[PDB]
Structure 1
Amino acid sequence: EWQENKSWNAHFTEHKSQGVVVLWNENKQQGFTNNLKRANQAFLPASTFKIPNSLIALDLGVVKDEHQVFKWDGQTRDIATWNRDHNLITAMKYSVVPVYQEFARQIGEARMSKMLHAFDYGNEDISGNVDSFWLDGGIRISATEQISFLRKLYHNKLHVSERSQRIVKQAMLTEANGDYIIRAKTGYSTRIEPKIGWWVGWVELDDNVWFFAMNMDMPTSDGLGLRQAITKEVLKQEKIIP
């Protein structure tokens, strides 16, 4: 069911960091992690909320499809990639917060709450600003809850149209080669302590899918690449990827 392998802690220790990687074998219905305590420790989802946010916007028509353009609002922000026009694909790719803040306001406080209950998403608490609760509000989710949510999305079992779920999984596309496909979303929570990085998603193989969910303490932006680098070192160790 759930087995803990502390050997993976080296991958966090080698970099003087702390965090958890959670893997779920879909064929075997078996989970694996380095720290079962942290695996269930709930944090702010931050930009990982793009996934449910994207799903909700699409299903209500706030976003019509992955080609619709969302014009830069002309306010120059500290991240250049945000200072341009975007569609759902590029908005997800560059974690464009201002676009999803506009989604949330159009979704509305009421509808956002029901959908997150329908999704059984985390603590289902949207306390705070409707356009920032996933960055500095009351919502919390753990790695194992992320994986559980992702599993429904993969299997099109969330209570939104199949189309909306297919479109988001398209937007989640991160890496694809002859060996595997990764559909995932990054997260960086800085507005409330502790500062952490997220990476959640799954690795599609020919005959199996490995869902993953990782977070780690993130005092400075210098270690943002360790989110994927540590996850991939674990996937290699377990011969999930070469």
Structure 2
Amino acid sequence: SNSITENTSWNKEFSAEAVNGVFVLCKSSSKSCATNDLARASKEYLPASTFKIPNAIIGLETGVIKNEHQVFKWDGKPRAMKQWERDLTLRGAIQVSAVPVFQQIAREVGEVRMQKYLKKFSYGNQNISGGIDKFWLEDQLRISAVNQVEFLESLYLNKLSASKENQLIVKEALVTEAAPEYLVHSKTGFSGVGTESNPGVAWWVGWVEKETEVYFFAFNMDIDNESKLPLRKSIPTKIMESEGIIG
């Protein structure tokens, strides 16, 4: 039976940087999750670029993305970021969070199929209103940290409603750190700075394959200044280092 507990030993990592946020860490073998804040762990926020994980799976499952070697060609038209003005592989597009590449994937998938897959995946509030290519950036789609770790555990076990081949392709594209004892798969997200009363959200979600154990994690925090952005990885990294998972 799945369980969750609230911890306090991680609060010092948040208050030291004056951050309002939540970390959820689940140990696969014990089906046990721990968090610094049960209420915020259940609160649903815009997934932003973390939506690229289900978007990639749906793109492959629908055939919009032909295979793992698919190249997304840049047509030479100006893009919002210098980093996106080039041909990208699936891993390249995921690594730099290339919004235009995923906007085009979502358009070819279409609203009917996108809605079907988000329901099969139990992904957040499953609300894709506001436009087929912006409902995850600044739309109505919301997902909690607890829902993110449930979704990533399904992906890890190849239990999503998609071919094992397509789940394996996305799992390898999400590798961000490799060491002899562990492999980190992760994805960042940032909705924007919002306002002082309504700050934006920053995410870091993923999982760590350490020896024979697997740890699923989801971090989110309020962000009103782009200088705080490095904290989306430093806070969860410091917590997982103190737990002996990475480092």
- How does the TM-score come out when normalised to structure 1? 0.97
Q: 1:189 aligns with which of 176, 191, 201?
A: 191
Work out the CA distance in 1 between the residues paired with 2:37 and 2:139.
Answer: 26
Work out the CA distance in 2 between the residues paired with 1:80 and 1:89.
Answer: 17
**Does the 8 A contact of 2:207 with 2:214 survive in 1?**
yes
Within 5 Å, which residues of 2 pair with 1:67-216? 67-190=69-192, 193-216=198-221
Instruction: Give 2:31's aligned residue.
Output: 29
Work out the CA distance in 2 between the residues paired with 1:191 and 1:85.
Answer: 29
Work out the CA distance in 2 between the residues paired with 1:179 and 1:234.
Answer: 18
Instruction: Give 2:59's aligned residue.
Output: 57
**Does the 8 A contact of 2:137 with 2:191 survive in 1?**
yes
- After superposition, the C-alpha distances for 1:35-59 in whole angstroms (9 at most, x for unaligned) are 1110011000000000000000001
Unaligned runs of 5+ in 1: none
- After superposition, the C-alpha distances for 1:63-83 in whole angstroms (9 at most, x for unaligned) are 011211111132323421111
Identity %: 48
Q: Say which SS state the counterpart of residue 72 (structure 1) adopts.
A: coil
Question: What's the offset of the Cα at 1:191?
Answer: 7.8
Work out the CA distance in 2 between the residues paired with 1:151 and 1:65.
Answer: 23
Work out the CA distance in 1 between the residues paired with 2:129 and 2:15.
Answer: 35
Q: Say which SS state the counterpart of residue 183 (structure 1) adopts.
A: strand
* Residue identity opposite 2:223 in structure 1: M
- After superposition, the C-alpha distances for 1:133-163 in whole angstroms (9 at most, x for unaligned) are 0011111100000000111100000001111
Instruction: Give 1:225's aligned residue.
Output: 230
**Does the 8 A contact of 1:136 with 1:191 survive in 2?**
no
- How does the TM-score come out when normalised to structure 2? 0.95
Unaligned runs of 5+ in 2: none
**Does the 8 A contact of 1:135 with 1:191 survive in 2?**
no
Q: Say which SS state the counterpart of residue 151 (structure 1) adopts.
A: helix
Work out the CA distance in 2 between the residues paired with 1:3 and 1:161.
Answer: 33
**Does the 8 A contact of 1:12 with 1:18 survive in 2?**
yes
RMSD: 1.2
Work out the CA distance in 1 between the residues paired with 2:79 and 2:15.
Answer: 35
